[PDB]
Each structure stands twice: as C-alpha cells, then as structure tokens.
Design a protein around this motif. Sequence first.
Motif, PDB file in Angstrom:
ATOM      1  N   UNK A 186       0.797  -1.223   0.000  1.00 40.53           N
ATOM      2  CA  UNK A 186       0.000   0.000   0.000  1.00 40.53           C
ATOM      3  C   UNK A 186       0.832   1.278   0.000  1.00 40.53           C
ATOM      4  N   UNK A 187       0.395   2.243  -0.804  1.00 44.04           N
ATOM      5  CA  UNK A 187       0.845   3.607  -0.617  1.00 44.04           C
ATOM      6  C   UNK A 187       0.244   4.209   0.638  1.00 44.04           C
ATOM      7  N   UNK A 188       0.861   5.279   1.121  1.00 45.40           N
ATOM      8  CA  UNK A 188       0.184   6.078   2.140  1.00 45.40           C
ATOM      9  C   UNK A 188      -1.145   6.628   1.600  1.00 45.40           C
ATOM     10  N   UNK A 189      -1.958   7.144   2.524  1.00 42.81           N
ATOM     11  CA  UNK A 189      -3.283   7.635   2.152  1.00 42.81           C
ATOM     12  C   UNK A 189      -3.166   8.692   1.071  1.00 42.81           C
ATOM     13  N   UNK A 190      -2.147   9.543   1.164  1.00 43.27           N
ATOM     14  CA  UNK A 190      -1.963  10.615   0.193  1.00 43.27           C
ATOM     15  C   UNK A 190      -1.112  10.224  -1.025  1.00 43.27           C
ATOM     16  N   UNK A 191      -0.708   8.960  -1.090  1.00 44.62           N
ATOM     17  CA  UNK A 191      -0.027   8.437  -2.301  1.00 44.62           C
ATOM     18  C   UNK A 191       1.455   8.719  -2.335  1.00 44.62           C
ATOM     19  N   UNK A 192       1.990   8.721  -3.542  1.00 39.84           N
ATOM     20  CA  UNK A 192       3.446   8.710  -3.703  1.00 39.84           C
ATOM     21  C   UNK A 192       3.997  10.128  -3.457  1.00 39.84           C
TER      22      UNK A 192
END
Lengths: 379, 379
Positions: free
Chosen positions: B48-54
Amino acid sequence: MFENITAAPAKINLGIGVYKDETGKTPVLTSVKKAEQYLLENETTKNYLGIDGIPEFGRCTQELLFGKGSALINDKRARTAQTPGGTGALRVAADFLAKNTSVKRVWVSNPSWPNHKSVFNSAGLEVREYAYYDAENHTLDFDALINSLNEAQAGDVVLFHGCCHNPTGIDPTLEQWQTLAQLSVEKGWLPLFDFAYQGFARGLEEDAEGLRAFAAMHKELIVASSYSKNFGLYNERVGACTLVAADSETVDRAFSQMKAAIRANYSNPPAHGASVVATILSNDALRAIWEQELTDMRQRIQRMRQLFVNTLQEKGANRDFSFIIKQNGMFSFSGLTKEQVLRLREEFGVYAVASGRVNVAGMTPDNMAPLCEAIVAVL
Amino acid sequence: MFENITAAPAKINLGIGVYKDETGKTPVLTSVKKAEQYLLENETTKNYLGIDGIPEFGRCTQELLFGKGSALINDKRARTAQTPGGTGALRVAADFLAKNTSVKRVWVSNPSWPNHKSVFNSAGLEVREYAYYDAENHTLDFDALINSLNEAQAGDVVLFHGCCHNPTGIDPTLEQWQTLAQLSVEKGWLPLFDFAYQGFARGLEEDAEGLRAFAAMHKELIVASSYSKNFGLYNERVGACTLVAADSETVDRAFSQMKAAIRANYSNPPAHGASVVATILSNDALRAIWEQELTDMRQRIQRMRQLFVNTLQEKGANRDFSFIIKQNGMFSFSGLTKEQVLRLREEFGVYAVASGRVNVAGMTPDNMAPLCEAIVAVL
Ligand SMILES: Cc1ncc(COP(=O)(O)O)c(CNc2csc(C(=O)O)c2)c1O
Ligand SMILES: Cc1ncc(COP(=O)(O)O)c(CNc2csc(C(=O)O)c2)c1O
C-alpha cells in the motif's frame, strides 16, 4: 475556512497489514509480473473503462464468489462493478444504499476492521455492533451473536466477513453460516459480505461456502470483495462491489444507481490492477501459477500458526495457545492485554495492535524464537 | 430492498471525451510506455501507498501547479493527495469540505462538465450556477459572470476551470483572472480550481497563470487536478487534490481530515498511473519526451481548429466560425442547436453532444471535409 479544523484522530512488525514471505518481503507475485509484461506488450490505449470496469473482471469475480454454473449467474441476478479496492467497494455499497434505499443502519461484528465504521458513517449510515468473540474459549460466541442481532430490525444491513474474520481469524462453520442464512431471511436483514481474504482460510471454493449458503437463500445481497491480499495487489486498488437482486430486471435497474454513485465518486475504476486480475483469471496457465502462489501463502501462514504454538510451548509459555492452529487467515488475537502489547513494543521491539491482534504472516522461522521469548517474558 | 429503486437517468465521433491523434487512435504515450517498462523491471512490491499516495507525485504536482520556487511551496502551505483521477480529487475535496467546514454551496459555471453537480451533490453540497458564456460573440460574458457571482456569499466555494474550460474552450485572460482573484478575496469565496487540461491551451506554465494569480492573493484554496488527458492515462485514474492554507500548521491539520475523508472512501490511491507520472516528471529524459508529446497534442488540436474554420468556409458555410481558432483545448461549442445536432447524427452519422459541443481532437485531415459538408448541410 480552515483555521479551526480539528485534526483527525489516530525488532519485529506483527502490526503489519500485508502478507510477508519467509524472507520478510512482500514481493510482487510472479503471475502478476507475467500479466504486467503481457499488458505492457499488448495495451494500445488507456481509454476510460466503463463505470463498472472491465467486463471479464466482473465475470471472473462472480465465478469466484458464486461458483461456475451458479443459478445467480445463469439467471443474470448479479451485477459487478470493479472498484478501487475492497474499501472502495464498501463505500460504493454504502453510498448506493444511503441514496437509494431505506437503510439507516449497518451491523458490524465486535471486533471488526476499524475502517468499517468510518466507511459507513461517511455515507451517513449508523453502525451498530453485534457480539462475536468468546475470549475464554477463543472461539465464536454464537449464542451472543444471535442474541445481539435480534436487536437488528427488518431492512437493516448485516455485515459478514466472508472468511478469515479480521481481527479474530474466527469464522462460522458451514452449519453456523446456514443457521445465519435462515435467520437473515426470517428477520429481513440485507446481507453485506466483506470478502477480502478469499483463499487464505482453506481454499477458494471452501472460503466461499458461507457466502454461497446466503446466496442460496436470499433474493438480495451485496458483496464487497478485494484482490489486495490474494493477488498481492494492495496498492493497485483492485476490488469489486457485486449487487444481487431477485431477477435481472431488478438488478439491472438497481445497478444503474450503483453506477451513478460511482460516477459521482471517482468516475470509473483504475485499469492496471484489475486488468492483471482478469488476465490471470481468464488464462489457464496464469491462473494455475496464481492459484499455486495463493496456496503457498495460505500454507505458509498455517505453518507459522503451528510453529508459533509449538515455539511458545518450547519457550515455556505454559498456557494453551492451540486456538491459534484452528484460526484462519493472517490475523489472530494473541490473548495479550493492551499493556502486555505496550510492554512488548517498549521492552522487546515486538509490535502488535493494542487489541493483541497479531499478523501471523509477519512471523518467519528466523524471527519466531525471539518473538516467542518476548511474549513469554510478558505473560 | 431493491424492488422499488428508480433507474438512474442518462460516420464520425465528436462526442468523444478523449484526445485522438491524426489516425483517430488514442495510443498510450511513448513516455508512458517507457515508464511502465521501468516499473515492470524495478518494482519489488505492491505494498500500500500512504493515504496521500506517492510523495514524489505530490512534489511534482505542486511544482506543475504553482511553479518551482513558489512561496506556497517554500512556506509548506500546500499538501497534495494523489487521487483516482480529477473526479476523485473533486469528490475528496467535496467530502472534506462537507464534513469539516461550514461550506454548503459550490458555484459552477453555466455551462460546465455535467458531472460537477453530481459530485458535489453526492457530498451533500448544493450547486449554484454563474453566468459565463456570451453566445453572440462566442466569448466570456465577464460582466454577467461578475453579476451572477455577486449572489455568492462569504464562505461559498467558487469553482474555476483552470484552463481549457469544458465545454466552451473559453478561458479568462490573465487580467480577467487577476480581477477574479481580487474579487474572490474581497467577497470571501473559497476558490476550487479544476485543472484537467494543463498544457492543452498554451503550455504548462501559461495554463497555470490564472491559478497562480489566485494563489498569490489567497490564504486558502483547493486544486483538483487530473493527468488523464495530458498523460493519456485516462483509465489509470491519476489526479491530485491539493489543499492550500495560510501556513504549514494549518494546512497539515486540515489535511489530516482530507486524509480521513480518503480513508473512508477508497483507503489509499492506485499506484500504477501515478507512479508513471512521478517517474516521468522526476526524470529529465522522460519528462522531455512527455513534454513534447503534450506539445504535439496541443498543436494538433490547434491545427484542427484552423482546418475546421478554413474547411467550413471552403464548403460554403458563409458564417463566421473564427471564434473556434481562439478557443482552447479539445472542446468548443459549434453554435449548432440541439435539433441541428440531432439532424447531424441521424442524417449524416456525425455525433456531437446536444449543446453543440464538439471535440476538435476528434477531427482529422481525413474526416474534415465530410464533417464540414454535413455541418454546412444543417445550417
Ligand atoms: C475485513 C476487511 N475489509 C476491507 C478491507 C479493505 O481491503 P482493500 O481496500 O485494502 O482491498 C480489508 C483489508 N484492508 C486492510 C489493509 S491492512 C488491514 C488490517 O486490518 O491490518 C486491513 C479487510 O481485511
Ligand atoms: C472540467 C473537468 N473536470 C473533471 C474531469 C474528470 O477528469 P478525470 O476524472 O477523467 O481525470 C474532466 C475530464 N473528465 C472527462 C472525461 S470525458 C469529459 C467530457 O466532458 O467529454 C470529461 C474535466 O474535463
């Protein structure tokens, strides 16, 4: 506008949420890499998918859920939307229900995945809890479950984990699922299955037994499924929301509003991960490689369950942990208290959630002895 | 539960929504293919990415929006969440605003993309329209726009298309953007920029002029941006929701609630498409290839605008269509009525939307003469 906003609330990792192999890695599955190379070579456009995503993905999903030759499929009673993960499927279901039905309440087990409450509340639905866990026998408290759910009114949604209950790893037996299916029809509940771990308990078909016992008895249900764990496709956001109704005319009409809820959310779903899944599931060779990779993950978890129990005994725990062998999927409650978990983190660098849930897939033959020594130290 | 649900409402294709090249294809960009091969070779996990993405995707997005060396960036006033497309960014913004602020209303131009109303209404926000289009001069009716927006109260959101207004192709001049920026501060509006076409009007930096004039004057704004069209990544669902506040402490606290709204929707965003964008934007060689591919698309659209005007004149339209040359992006109103559009479809197999909007990128040197003959026939 923003100046008064309140902030949102919030060595070995057993607090991890993904599968790890024996080396402690979460590699891309080989079947997935082969599918990605096929897509690189063959895609000629990134033109939008339809709102409900790739048709083959939907067909293969319904066959995994209901079985090839299911009456639900033959009678065209189910419609599937490809979604951004299991979470996106749960939110599409919640928004569909909030806007198009009289549903006000969703019943979730105590305990469950903590994000269930957030998803349903986001859509304006209340969440109520039903009893689930008998902590003395480390088993399903079936009588308490049924007693709790008697408070559920006709037209409430009841959420069931299809297999590998998160966090307990405790699933209904087939007979218990059949009893719940009957009760649900009698009481007028709308079942919502959350199916994020198909294949991690006993096998693809075995793990769908409970859902299929419900499907045999109900005119209507929704399934929110995820391919994050069983394809190792976590970050590609690959899931499905499957709507079932009494007949094709009804499901098609209802599904039009499910598509409207998607259009107003993220328009249409991300192709890469779902196209990997459809490519694998619809090809005999790739599907066989993938099914074996999933079996390898399921079996490694079972070996860790057994090795954890045996090692705790060898390290002098002197406490029955045999319940761990019988539980299903990556998660179990260890039976440690919140303070023992905190002690484990602070004194030993071993990380679990405060409930005492551990990810058995975080255990390896290499990290097992120190992990068990740490646990024995805090008993 | 579902039996009474109401159904949702609903030769040459100028009704298409994507870019087409001179052969009428929407191929994958070469920069994108090269990036996808790099990812195939180098990814070692789908964790998974973090909630806010890359993170790199967020940094490169803020530089495209605000300019490298922007005070907003230096002062850490902006936070970006990678989202599933521009639509997902608009819905995350709407859900963030509905749950965390006093916003009740969003002002959208008449006309706009029809999905704006659906997205904001889904989050419980009312949509109000402001005047925009002067159909006699085929221009921005600036006086009407300002007069409409005087009904907007302090604390309402006003949505602006950053460039390439959809459907008109008519954008404010820089001076008009500066007048709107000043008015917005005076009236207490929260600007929401929808930026789906950066690079298709004049250039990446030029197309962000209006947004940057707003950013220079406002403590707070939100930008919902999309890489669907300028990377040809439609189906990978690649966009961003950028939150700007007066200072780092405030934006970070507000952004925590934006992340909560994402977690309750789709958990975390799809990696493939955004990782392609980050890989391209952060690499000098790939970025140069991509920037040229975007210039090629922008220039082909301009050639079609000119060829359409010239060809209508050669085919005997005898009507001024010169406004088409000056409009920006893939869309323009042709000035045809709904019945002329219907006639075009039925008698000639030429397809536009009922408003008369046409996708100029659907025009090619090969299909231009028959298209223009058809249009002249219905005048
Ligand atoms: C019961 C249940 N429902 C929904 C989800 C969401 O799955 P994805 O959205 O990641 O596909 C999941 C898996 N999401 C998840 C990621 S970490 C985690 C955990 O409990 O640690 C859970 C799940 O176990
Ligand atoms: C003004 C504006 N706002 C939001 C969007 C959504 O972009 P994506 O969600 O596809 O990235 C778009 C592009 N979405 C879109 C696909 S077809 C289309 C059209 O107007 O034909 C529009 C847009 O033009």
